[PDB]
């Protein structure tokens, strides 16, 4: 039965997701914070999607690297095609969902990855950051407070739901986030930020000695 193959693929991708590290995205006073427990200094599951648009992924590494590269290509194509401001992370999420549902249906082996994207307001404008969660089958979800990803979602999710503080300070958001993830050291942990106060590009990686000082 086609349903048999579909369901087996579904729990296949799900269990591939389960055997992955935990990544979190949360909106705070200055924008969005990204935290990942990445042991590899070379590998980065988090990147920038556009000047105000960030990238968060977890799952099979090369797969979501392909997704990151394709999305970056399309975003640059659109920004040059129309305008920088004409790019909205909603569009990027739509594209990602389209290709994800595509490959989930047609490809012999799906992508056992989950995607999250955060978009921050342009410089000098006020707007709540928007968080979009895109699972392997392309199910887009908007989580207005925080996004969790990878591994045992339930405990960390409950921890953030009970602990979530709106407009949390950069250091405060960092501390609550690391507390949630422990449910570790500066090393083996990836932290990056979308800063709405940034003039053009909001992305920034806060790592190493700066991260230690923040901790």
């Amino acid at each position: 039965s086609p349903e048999q193959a579909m369901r087996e693929r579904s729990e296949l991708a799900r269990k591939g997701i389960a055997r992955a590290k935990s990544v979190v995205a949360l909106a705070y006073a200055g924008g969005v914070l990204f935290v990942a427990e990445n042991p590899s200094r070379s590998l980065q599951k988090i990147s920038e999607l556009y000047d105000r648009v960030g990238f968060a992924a977890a799952g099979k590494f090369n797969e979501f690297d392909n997704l990151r590269r394709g999305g970056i290509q399309f975003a640059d194509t659109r920004g040059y095609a129309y305008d920088r401001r004409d790019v909205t992370g909603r569009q990027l999420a739509n594209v990602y969902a389209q290709t994800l549902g595509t490959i989930f249906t047609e490809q012999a082996k799906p992508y056992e990855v989950e995607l999250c994207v955060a978009e921050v307001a342009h410089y000098g404008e006020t707007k709540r950051p928007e968080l979009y969660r895109i699972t392997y089958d392309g199910s887009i979800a908007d989580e207005p407070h925080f996004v969790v990803m990878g591994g045992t979602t339930e405990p960390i999710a409950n921890a953030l739901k009970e602990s979530y503080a709106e407009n949390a300070s950069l250091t405060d958001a960092l501390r609550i986030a690391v507390a949630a993830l422990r449910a570790l050291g500066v090393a083996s942990l990836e932290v990056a930020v979308l800063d709405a106060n940034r003039p053009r590009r909001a992305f920034r990686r806060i790592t190493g000695s700066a991260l230690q000082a923040l901790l």
Partner: peptide
Amino acid sequence: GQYL
């Protein structure tokens, strides 16, 4: 594969 690589899950990291």
